[PDB]
mmCIF file of C-alpha atoms and ligand atoms in Angstrom:
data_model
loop_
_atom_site.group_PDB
_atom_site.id
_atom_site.type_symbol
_atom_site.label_atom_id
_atom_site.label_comp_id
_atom_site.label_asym_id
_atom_site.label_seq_id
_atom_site.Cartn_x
_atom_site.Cartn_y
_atom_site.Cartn_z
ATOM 1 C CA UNK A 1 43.793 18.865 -36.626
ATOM 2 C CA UNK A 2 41.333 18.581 -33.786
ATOM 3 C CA UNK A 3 40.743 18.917 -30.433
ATOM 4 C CA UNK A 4 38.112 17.429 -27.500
ATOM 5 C CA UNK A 5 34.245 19.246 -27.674
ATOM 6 C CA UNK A 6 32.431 17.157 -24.389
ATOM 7 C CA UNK A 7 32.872 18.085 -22.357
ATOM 8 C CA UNK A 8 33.445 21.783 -23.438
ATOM 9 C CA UNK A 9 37.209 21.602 -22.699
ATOM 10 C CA UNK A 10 39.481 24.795 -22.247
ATOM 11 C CA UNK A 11 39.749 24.941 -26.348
ATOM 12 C CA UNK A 12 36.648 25.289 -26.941
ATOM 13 C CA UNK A 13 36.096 27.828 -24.593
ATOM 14 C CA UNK A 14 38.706 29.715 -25.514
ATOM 15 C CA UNK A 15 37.384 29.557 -28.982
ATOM 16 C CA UNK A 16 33.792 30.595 -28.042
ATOM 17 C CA UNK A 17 35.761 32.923 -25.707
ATOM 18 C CA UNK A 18 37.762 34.997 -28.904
ATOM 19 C CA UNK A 19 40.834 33.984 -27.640
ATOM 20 C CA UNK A 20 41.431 31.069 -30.009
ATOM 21 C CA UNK A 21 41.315 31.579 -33.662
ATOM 22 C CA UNK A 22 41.705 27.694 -34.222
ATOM 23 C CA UNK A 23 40.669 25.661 -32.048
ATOM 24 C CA UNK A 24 41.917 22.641 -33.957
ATOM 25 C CA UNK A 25 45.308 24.256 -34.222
ATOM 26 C CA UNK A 26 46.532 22.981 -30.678
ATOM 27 C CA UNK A 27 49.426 20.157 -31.890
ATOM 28 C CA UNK A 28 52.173 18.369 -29.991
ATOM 29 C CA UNK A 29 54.437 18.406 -32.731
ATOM 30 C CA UNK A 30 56.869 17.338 -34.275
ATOM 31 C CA UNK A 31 56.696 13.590 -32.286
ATOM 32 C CA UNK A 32 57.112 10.118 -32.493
ATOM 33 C CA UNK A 33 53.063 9.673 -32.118
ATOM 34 C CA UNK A 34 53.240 6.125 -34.043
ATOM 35 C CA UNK A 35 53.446 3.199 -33.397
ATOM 36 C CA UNK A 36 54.256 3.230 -29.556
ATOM 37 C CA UNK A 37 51.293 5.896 -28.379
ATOM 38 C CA UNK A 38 53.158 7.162 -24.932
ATOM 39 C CA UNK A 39 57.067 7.655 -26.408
ATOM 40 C CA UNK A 40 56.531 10.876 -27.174
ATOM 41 C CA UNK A 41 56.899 12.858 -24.495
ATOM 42 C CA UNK A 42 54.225 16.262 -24.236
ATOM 43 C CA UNK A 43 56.694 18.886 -23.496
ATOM 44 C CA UNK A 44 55.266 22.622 -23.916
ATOM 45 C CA UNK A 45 52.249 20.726 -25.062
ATOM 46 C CA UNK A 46 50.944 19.173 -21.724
ATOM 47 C CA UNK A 47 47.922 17.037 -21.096
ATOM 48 C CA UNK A 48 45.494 20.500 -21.874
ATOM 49 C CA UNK A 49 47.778 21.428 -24.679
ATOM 50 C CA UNK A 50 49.383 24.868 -26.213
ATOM 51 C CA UNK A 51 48.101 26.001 -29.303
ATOM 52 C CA UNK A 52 50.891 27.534 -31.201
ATOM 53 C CA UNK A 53 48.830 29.370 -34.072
ATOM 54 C CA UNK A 54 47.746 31.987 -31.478
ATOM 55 C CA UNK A 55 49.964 30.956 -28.560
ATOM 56 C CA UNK A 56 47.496 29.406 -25.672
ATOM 57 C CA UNK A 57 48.746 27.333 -23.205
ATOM 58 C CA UNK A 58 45.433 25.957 -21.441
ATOM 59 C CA UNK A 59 47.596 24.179 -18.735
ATOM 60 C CA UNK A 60 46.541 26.749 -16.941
ATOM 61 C CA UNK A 61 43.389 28.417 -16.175
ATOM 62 C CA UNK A 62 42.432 32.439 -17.381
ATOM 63 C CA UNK A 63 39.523 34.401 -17.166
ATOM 64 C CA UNK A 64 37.764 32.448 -20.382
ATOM 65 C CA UNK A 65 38.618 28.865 -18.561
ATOM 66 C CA UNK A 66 39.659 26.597 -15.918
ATOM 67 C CA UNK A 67 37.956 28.855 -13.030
ATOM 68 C CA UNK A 68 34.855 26.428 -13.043
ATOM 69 C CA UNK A 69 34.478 22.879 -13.547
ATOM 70 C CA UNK A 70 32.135 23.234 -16.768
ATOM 71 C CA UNK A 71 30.503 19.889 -16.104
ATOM 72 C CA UNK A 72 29.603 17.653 -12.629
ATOM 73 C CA UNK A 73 29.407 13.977 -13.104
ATOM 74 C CA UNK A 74 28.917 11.339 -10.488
ATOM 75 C CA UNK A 75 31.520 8.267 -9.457
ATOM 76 C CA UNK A 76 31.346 5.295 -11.477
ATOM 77 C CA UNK A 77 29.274 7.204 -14.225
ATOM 78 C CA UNK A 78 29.404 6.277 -18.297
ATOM 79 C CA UNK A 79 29.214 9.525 -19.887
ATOM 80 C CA UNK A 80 29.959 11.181 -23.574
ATOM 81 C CA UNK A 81 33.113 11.971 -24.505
ATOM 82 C CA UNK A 82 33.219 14.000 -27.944
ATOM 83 C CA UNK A 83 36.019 15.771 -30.116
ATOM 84 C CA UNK A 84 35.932 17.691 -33.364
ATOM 85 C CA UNK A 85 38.154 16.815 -36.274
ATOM 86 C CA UNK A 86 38.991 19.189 -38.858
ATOM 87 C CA UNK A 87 38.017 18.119 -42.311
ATOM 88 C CA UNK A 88 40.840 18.897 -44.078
ATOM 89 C CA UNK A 89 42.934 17.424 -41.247
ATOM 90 C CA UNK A 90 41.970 13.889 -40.331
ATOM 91 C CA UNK A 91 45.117 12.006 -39.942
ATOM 92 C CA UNK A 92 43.477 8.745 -38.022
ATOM 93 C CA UNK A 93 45.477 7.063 -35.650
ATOM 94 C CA UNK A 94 44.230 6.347 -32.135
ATOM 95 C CA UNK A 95 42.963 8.270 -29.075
ATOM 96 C CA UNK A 96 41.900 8.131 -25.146
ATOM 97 C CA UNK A 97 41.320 9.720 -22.450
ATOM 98 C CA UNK A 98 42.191 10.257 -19.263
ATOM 99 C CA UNK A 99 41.684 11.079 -15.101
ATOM 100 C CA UNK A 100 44.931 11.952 -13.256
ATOM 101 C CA UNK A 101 43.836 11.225 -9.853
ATOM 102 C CA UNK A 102 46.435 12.944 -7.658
ATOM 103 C CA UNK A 103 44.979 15.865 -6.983
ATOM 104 C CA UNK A 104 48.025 17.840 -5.653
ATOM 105 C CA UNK A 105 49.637 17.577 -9.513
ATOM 106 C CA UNK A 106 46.102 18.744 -11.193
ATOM 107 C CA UNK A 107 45.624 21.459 -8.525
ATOM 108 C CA UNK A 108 49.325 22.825 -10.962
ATOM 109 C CA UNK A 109 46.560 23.121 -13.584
ATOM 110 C CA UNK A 110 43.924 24.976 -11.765
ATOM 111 C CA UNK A 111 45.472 28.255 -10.884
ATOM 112 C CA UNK A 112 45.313 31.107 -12.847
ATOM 113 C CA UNK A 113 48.487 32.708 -11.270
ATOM 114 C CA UNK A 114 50.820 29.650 -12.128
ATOM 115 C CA UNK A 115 51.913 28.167 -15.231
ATOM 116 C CA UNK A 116 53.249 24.155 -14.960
ATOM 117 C CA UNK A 117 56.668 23.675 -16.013
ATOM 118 C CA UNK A 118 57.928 21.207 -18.604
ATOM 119 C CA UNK A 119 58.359 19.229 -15.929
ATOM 120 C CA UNK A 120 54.974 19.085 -14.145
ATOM 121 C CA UNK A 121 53.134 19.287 -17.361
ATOM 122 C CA UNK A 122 55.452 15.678 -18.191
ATOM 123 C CA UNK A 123 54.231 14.262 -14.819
ATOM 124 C CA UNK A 124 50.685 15.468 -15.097
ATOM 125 C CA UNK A 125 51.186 13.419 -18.640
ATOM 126 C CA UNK A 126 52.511 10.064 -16.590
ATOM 127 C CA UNK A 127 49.727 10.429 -13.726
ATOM 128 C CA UNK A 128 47.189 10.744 -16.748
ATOM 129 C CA UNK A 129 48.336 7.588 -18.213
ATOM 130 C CA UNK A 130 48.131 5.853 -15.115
ATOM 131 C CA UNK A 131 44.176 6.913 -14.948
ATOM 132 C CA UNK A 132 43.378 6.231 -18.780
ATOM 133 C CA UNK A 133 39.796 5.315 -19.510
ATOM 134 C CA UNK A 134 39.931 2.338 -20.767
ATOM 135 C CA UNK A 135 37.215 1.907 -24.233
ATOM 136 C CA UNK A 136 36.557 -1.610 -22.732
ATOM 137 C CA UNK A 137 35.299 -0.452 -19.310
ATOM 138 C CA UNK A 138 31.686 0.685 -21.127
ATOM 139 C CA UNK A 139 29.169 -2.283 -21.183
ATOM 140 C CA UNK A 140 28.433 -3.032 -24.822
ATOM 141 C CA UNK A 141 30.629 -0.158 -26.393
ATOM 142 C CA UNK A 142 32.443 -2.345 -29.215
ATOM 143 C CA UNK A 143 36.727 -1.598 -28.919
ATOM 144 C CA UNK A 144 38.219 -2.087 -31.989
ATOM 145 C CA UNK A 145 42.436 -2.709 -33.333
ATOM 146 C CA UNK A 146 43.693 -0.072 -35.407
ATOM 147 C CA UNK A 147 43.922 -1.317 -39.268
ATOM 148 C CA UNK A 148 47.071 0.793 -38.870
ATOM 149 C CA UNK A 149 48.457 -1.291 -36.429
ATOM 150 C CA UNK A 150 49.497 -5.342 -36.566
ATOM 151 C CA UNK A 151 48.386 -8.096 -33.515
ATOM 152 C CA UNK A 152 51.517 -7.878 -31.035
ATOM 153 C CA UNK A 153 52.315 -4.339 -31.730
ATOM 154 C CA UNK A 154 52.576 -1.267 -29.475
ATOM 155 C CA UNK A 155 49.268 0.265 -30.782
ATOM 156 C CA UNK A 156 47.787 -2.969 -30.368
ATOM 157 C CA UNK A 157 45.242 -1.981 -27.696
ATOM 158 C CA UNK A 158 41.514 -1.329 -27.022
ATOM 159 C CA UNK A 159 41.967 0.522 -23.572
ATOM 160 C CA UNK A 160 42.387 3.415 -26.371
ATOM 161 C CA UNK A 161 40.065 4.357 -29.256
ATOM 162 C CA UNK A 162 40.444 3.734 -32.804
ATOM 163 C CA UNK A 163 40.041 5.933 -36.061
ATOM 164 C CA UNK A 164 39.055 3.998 -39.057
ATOM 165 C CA UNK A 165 41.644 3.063 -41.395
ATOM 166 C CA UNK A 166 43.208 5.868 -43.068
ATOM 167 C CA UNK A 167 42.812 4.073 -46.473
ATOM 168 C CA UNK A 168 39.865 1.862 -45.657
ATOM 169 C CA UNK A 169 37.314 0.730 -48.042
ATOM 170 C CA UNK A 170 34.332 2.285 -46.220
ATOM 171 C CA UNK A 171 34.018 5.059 -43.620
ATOM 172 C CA UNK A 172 37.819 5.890 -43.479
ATOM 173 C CA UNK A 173 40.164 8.209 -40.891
ATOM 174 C CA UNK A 174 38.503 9.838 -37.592
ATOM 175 C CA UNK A 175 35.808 10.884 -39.785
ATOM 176 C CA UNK A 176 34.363 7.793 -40.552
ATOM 177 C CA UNK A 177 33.589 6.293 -36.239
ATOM 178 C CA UNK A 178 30.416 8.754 -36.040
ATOM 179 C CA UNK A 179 30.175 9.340 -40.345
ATOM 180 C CA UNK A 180 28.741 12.983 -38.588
ATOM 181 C CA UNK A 181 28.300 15.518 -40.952
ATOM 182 C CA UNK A 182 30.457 18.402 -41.799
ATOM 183 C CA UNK A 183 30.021 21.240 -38.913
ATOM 184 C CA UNK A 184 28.276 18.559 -36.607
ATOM 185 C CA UNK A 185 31.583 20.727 -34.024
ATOM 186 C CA UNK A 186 33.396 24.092 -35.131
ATOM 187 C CA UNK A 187 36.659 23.727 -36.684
ATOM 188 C CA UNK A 188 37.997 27.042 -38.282
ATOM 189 C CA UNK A 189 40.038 25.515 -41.017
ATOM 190 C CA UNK A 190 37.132 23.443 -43.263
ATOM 191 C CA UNK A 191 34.543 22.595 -40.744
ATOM 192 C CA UNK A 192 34.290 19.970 -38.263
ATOM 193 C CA UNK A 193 33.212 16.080 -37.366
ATOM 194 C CA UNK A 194 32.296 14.669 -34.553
ATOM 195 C CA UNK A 195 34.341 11.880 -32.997
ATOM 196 C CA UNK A 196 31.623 10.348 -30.409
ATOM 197 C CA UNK A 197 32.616 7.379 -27.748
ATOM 198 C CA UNK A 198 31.733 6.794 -23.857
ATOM 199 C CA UNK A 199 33.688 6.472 -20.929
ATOM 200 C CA UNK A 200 33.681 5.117 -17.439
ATOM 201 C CA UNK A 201 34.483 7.605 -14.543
ATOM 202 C CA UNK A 202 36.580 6.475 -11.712
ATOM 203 C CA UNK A 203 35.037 5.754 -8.321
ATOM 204 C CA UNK A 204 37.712 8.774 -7.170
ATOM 205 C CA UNK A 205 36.381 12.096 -6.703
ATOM 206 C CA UNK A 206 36.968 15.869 -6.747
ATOM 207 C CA UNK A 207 35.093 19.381 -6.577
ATOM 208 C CA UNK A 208 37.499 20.357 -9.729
ATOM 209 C CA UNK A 209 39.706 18.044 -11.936
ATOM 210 C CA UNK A 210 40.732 17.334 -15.525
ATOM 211 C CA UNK A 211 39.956 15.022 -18.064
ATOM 212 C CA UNK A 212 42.780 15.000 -20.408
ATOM 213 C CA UNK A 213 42.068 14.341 -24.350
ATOM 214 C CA UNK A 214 44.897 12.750 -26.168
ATOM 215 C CA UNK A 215 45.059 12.173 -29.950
ATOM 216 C CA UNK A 216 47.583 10.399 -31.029
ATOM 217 C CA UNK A 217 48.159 10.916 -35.213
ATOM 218 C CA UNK A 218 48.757 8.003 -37.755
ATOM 219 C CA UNK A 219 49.465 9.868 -40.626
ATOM 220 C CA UNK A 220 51.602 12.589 -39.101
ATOM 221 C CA UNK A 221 54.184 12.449 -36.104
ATOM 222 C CA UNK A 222 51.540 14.968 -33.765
ATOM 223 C CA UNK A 223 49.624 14.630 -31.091
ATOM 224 C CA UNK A 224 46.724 16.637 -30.241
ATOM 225 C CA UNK A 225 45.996 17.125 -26.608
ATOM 226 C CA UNK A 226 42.563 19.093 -24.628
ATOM 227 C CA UNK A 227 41.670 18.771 -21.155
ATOM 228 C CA UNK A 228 37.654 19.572 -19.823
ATOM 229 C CA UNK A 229 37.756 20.878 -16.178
ATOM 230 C CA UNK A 230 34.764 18.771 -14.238
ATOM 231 C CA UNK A 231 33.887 17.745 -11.317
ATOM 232 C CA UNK A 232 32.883 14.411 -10.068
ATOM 233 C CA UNK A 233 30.205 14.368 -7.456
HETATM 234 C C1 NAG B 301 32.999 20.551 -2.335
HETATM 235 O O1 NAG B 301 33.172 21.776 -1.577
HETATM 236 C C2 NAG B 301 32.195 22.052 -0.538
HETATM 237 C C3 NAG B 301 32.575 23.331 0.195
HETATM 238 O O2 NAG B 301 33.764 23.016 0.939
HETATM 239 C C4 NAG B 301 32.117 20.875 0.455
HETATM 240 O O3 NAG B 301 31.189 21.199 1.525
HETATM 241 C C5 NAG B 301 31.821 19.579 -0.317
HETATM 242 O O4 NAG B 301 31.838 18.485 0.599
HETATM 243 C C6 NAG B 301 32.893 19.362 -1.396
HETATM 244 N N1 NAG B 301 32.676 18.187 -2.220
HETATM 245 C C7 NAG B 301 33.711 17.399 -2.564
HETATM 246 C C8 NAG B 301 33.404 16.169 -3.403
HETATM 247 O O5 NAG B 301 34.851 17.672 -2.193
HETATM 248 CU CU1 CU B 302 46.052 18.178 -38.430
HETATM 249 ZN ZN1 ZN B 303 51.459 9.859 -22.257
HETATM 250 ZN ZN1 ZN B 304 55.590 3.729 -24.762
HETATM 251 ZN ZN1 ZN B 305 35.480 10.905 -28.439
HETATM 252 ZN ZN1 ZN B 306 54.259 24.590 -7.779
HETATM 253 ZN ZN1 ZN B 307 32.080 -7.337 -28.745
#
């Protein structure tokens, strides 16, 4: 149970916003989300997801979000990607995120007036792949295997994140990368932690876009997707 916190994506402003109830409760689900990390396919879910406790779909924008680009960045730049995982729901696994950088599919995302289909919410998901952050693109930001995950395999890869092993000696789960205290973000269920990493932006630019959030579960078949809209400047 979690979802992304910086930027402030659509989530959380619908949380600060009344709307959402639980924040964390936004969950592709059920899914395939191990080992092979794109199978599953997003569905209703989306790359900004659809919370199902209180039934949000942030794929597109209302009066609470997705008007403004709630952050401007600049090409090229390293910046702080956060998100919040719910104490009593810290399933490790693996996460990323991600730029789509066709412009025409995003603008699907950034009108109030139109929901994305299915389908557009699937290709929105492929042109998101295509512009994943990679972990390694940071100078000095260390990109680690998952201990839930063997050399050769599909979640063999440090373009994504890693959680900590789920039954690790020290520091275990999504919990243990920052080792942030309990409501260091909001979560509604038992409190929050932090989940802190860095990304590269792309040299491609936009007055309004979306980074896309993606949480891919080890412990449970779910994936958790956000989206932040910024704008790159
Ligand atoms: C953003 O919009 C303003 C108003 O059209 C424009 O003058 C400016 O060049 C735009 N910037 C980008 C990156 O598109
Ligand atoms: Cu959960
Ligand atoms: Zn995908
Ligand atoms: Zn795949
Ligand atoms: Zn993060
Ligand atoms: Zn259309
Ligand atoms: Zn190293």
């Amino acid at each position: 149970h979690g979802y992304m916190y910086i930027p402030s994506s659509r989530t959380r402003l619908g949380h600060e916003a009344g709307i959402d109830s639980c924040p964390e409760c936004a969950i592709l689900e059920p899914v395939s989300s191990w080992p092979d990390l794109d199978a599953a396919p997003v569905g209703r879910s989306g790359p900004c997801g659809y919370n199902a406790r209180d039934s949000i779909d942030y794929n597109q924008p209302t009066t609470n979000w997705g008007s403004d680009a709630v952050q401007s960045y600049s090409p090229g730049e390293e910046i702080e990607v956060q998100w919040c995982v719910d104490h009593n729901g810290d399933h490790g696994g693996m996460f990323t995120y991600r730029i789509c950088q066709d412009q025409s599919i995003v603008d699907k995302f950034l009108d109030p007036s139109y929901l994305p289909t299915n389908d557009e919410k699937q290709a929105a998901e492929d042109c998101f792949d295509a512009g994943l952050l990679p972990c390694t693109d940071v100078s000095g930001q260390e990109c680690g295997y998952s201990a839930d995950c063997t050399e050769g395999e599909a979640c063999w890869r440090n373009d994504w994140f890693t959680c900590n092993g789920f039954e690790a000696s020290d520091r275990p789960k999504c919990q243990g990368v920052d080792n942030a205290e309990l409501n260091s973000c909001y979560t509604s269920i038992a409190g929050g932690y932090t989940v802190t990493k860095k990304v590269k932006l792309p040299e491609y630019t936009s007055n309004h876009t979306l980074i896309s959030f993606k949480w891919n579960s080890f412990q449970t078949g779910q994936i958790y997707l956000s989206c932040a809209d910024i704008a790159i400047q």
